[PDB]
């Protein structure tokens, strides 16, 4: 049955709840995002109405094959009415398409949904500056002070010097990059673009990309692989046996992989630097993490929710179990006490 989590008070909406069958009294399913864990349950066979940003609702139509006359897409930045309900959609800074949704609620409350987010100073001016929130149903997937990492900026420099760096020592490398959803393109979009290359990859994930409103992306990507000096594999076969084969396929045009995992947190953070990282070598096959967060870090997290001084926050991840629940209620006490709220 439906988590209460997902269920917005005063209203008929559920967000990200589509695994749960009929929700009793849902009149409006909204979606934040398109990863699985969100959609879950969505299909040709759905006939209520689903609110979403555009770039949502053109992955719905064409992945998931969900009818036109079903999709509500709702612009950003914009006050829009949905049965009876003021709403509006915000950028999370997650993967393309990625929402907030602020409800404002006929007797006054107002409400956030972060969906999932990665906080961001640009976000204290948006919309959210010109009222109070009284309730926010926040994404905790890292709240927790050992959550350290860069900036998106420094890895992707990282890599980009990285590259640049063994393609022009060796020419006949092959760069792979690992994917197993949006997100994170601009790992493989950088490394192609200061390699002069476009990047190469099967006609599902071609698809997929063609839905996202990326500017001059036919410029950058291509299912022929043989033109191309970036290859994006799916993530279970970025290991030295699955890019052992891999390399094999090319058919002698190349003769050393150097590989990219963008995961989102590893322990390497607590005790290194960007700058220090090392790859997994086997061979003349190198495998870089790197840590390449879609999510808030502890600090950008805290930043966020100190700046808006919610009355309540409602956690939306890691509430299975009770060491994790104590442990954040915990650290919102701390940041309400610091702050003065
Ligand atoms: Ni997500």
Not at 1 to 10: A, L, N, R, S
Not at 92 to 107: E, K, Q, R, S, T
Not at 311 to 324: A, D, F
Request: proline share 5%; charged share 15%.
């Amino acid at each position: 049955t439906c988590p209460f989590y997902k269920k917005i008070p005063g209203t008929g909406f559920t967000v990200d709840a589509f695994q749960y069958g009929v929700v009793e009294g849902c009149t409006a399913y909204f979606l934040t995002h398109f990863h699985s864990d969100h959609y879950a349950g969505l299909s040709k066979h759905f006939t209520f109405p689903v609110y979403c940003s555009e770039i949502t609702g053109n992955l719905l139509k064409n992945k998931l094959h969900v009818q036109e006359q079903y999709i509500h897409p709702l612009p950003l930045d914009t006050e829009c009415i949905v049965n009876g309900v003021k709403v509006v959609l915000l950028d999370a800074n997650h993967c393309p398409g990625a929402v907030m949704i602020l409800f404002y609620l006929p007797n006054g409350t107002v409400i956030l949904h972060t969906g999932d987010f990665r906080a961001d100073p640009s976000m204290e001016r948006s919309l959210l500056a010109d009222q109070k929130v009284h309730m926010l149903y926040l994404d905790t997937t890292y709240c927790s002070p050992e959550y350290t990492f860069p900036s998106q900026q420094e890895v992707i420099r990282f890599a980009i010097n990285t590259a640049f760096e063994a393609v022009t020592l060796n020419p006949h490398a092959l760069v792979v990059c690992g994917t197993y959803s949006i997100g994170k393109e601009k790992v493989f979009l950088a490394i192609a673009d200061v390699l002069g290359s476009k990047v190469g990859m099967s006609q599902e994930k071609y698809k997929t990309l063609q839905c996202l409103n990326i500017p001059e992306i036919n410029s950058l990507i291509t299912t022929d692989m043989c033109s191309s000096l970036v290859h994006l594999l799916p993530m279970m076969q970025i290991n030295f046996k699955g890019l052992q084969s891999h390399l094999k396929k090319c058919g002698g045009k190349y003769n050393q992989i150097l590989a990219f995992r963008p995961t989102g947190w590893t322990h390497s953070n607590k005790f290194t630097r960007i700058a220090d990282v090392i790859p997994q070598t086997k061979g003349n096959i190198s495998i870089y993490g790197i840590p390449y967060s879609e999510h808030s870090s502890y600090l950008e997290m805290k930043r966020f929710v100190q700046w808006l001084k919610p009355q309540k926050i409602i956690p939306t991840v890691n509430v299975g179990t009770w060491k994790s629940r104590s442990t954040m209620e915990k650290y919102f006490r701390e940041w309400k006490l610091e702050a003065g709220y």
